[PDB]
Design a binder for this molecule. Structure first.
Ligand SMILES: C[C@@H](O)[C@@H](C(=O)O)[C@H]1CC(SCCNC=N)=C(C(=O)O)N1
Length: 264
């Protein structure tokens, strides 16, 4: 594990913070781990799991995805580029889910959390798939505080990867819901400088990013489909000790590359 770990330790030292990585080859079972059981703030990366929770609920409530959500101005919070434009009409649950995943829309995220019973409702969904590490405690935008030591609104790289595998490739979602989730991740345009930058252009990638805006705290998780080979699932999370420390997309891409090249 010393030969595996040492390039990650070098990377996080030059970054000035901590990096957590977990990658799984779903065919052979091979893994790469670095700080994989440490907690890191989720930031907006929870929004991918939120959409999966909504899709899962639609398996027990026919028509949930078509349900109209007609909201007022108070539902709007900072960084709500899609939901801001439909204030005059409303949006359906599926339209809000697409906005949360592909634009990281904060109002859409809060509206979907409300549908699920709050942050506790998303945590309960994650428990239902066997994830005991994930916890969402607060709403947007308070969940982005990323204060050193705080376990609220965190998970671990290993738990993120394991849950992502269950939702995108396992049995948790029925086929139509599973393909919708995969399509939302594949079409996400916010992560071009993160895990996607480490992956050959020929290979499809679906990802969800998070960027807290403080404490150098940012992340990405992804499924990678190498052509004619079993898919890979991976997660890369960062944090830093000072409130004004800057996050780095380049560090996330570099750590993704180190993990992908070390699988086998
Ligand atoms: C709301 C803010 O904290 C952040 C988050 O939820 O983590 C929003 C803003 C951003 S927009 C991405 C900007 N990309 C620049 N290259 C993200 C994200 O990384 O997905 N989500």
């Amino acid at each position: 594990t010393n030969l595996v770990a040492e390039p990650f330790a070098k990377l996080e030292q030059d970054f000035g913070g901590s990096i957590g990585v977990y990658a799984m080859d779903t065919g052979s079972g091979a893994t790469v781990s670095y700080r994989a059981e440490e907690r890191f703030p989720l930031c907006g990366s929870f929004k991918g799991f939120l959409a999966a929770a909504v899709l899962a609920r639609s398996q027990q409530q026919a028509g949930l995805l078509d349900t109209p959500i007609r909201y007022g101005k108070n539902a709007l919070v900072p960084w709500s580029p899609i939901s801001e434009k439909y204030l005059t009409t409303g949006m359906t649950v599926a339209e809000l889910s697409a906005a949360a995943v592909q634009y990281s829309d904060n109002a859409a995220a809060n509206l979907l959390l409300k549908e699920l019973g709050g942050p506790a409702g998303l945590t309960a969904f994650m428990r239902s798939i066997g994830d005991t590490t994930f916890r969402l405690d607060r709403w947007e935008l308070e969940l982005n505080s990323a204060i050193p030591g705080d376990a609220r609104d965190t998970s671990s790289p290993r738990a993120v990867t394991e849950s992502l595998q269950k939702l995108t490739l396992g049995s948790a979602l029925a086929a139509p819901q599973r393909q919708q989730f995969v399509d939302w991740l594949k079409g996400n345009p916010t992560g071009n400088h993160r895990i996607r930058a480490a992956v050959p252009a020929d290979w499809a990638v679906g990802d969800k990013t998070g960027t807290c805006g403080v404490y150098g705290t940012a992340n990405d998780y992804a499924v990678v489909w190498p052509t004619g080979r079993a898919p890979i699932v991976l997660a890369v999370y960062t944090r830093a000790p000072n409130k004004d420390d800057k996050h780095s997309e380049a560090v996330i891409a570099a750590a993704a590359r180190l993990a992908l090249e070390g699988l086998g």
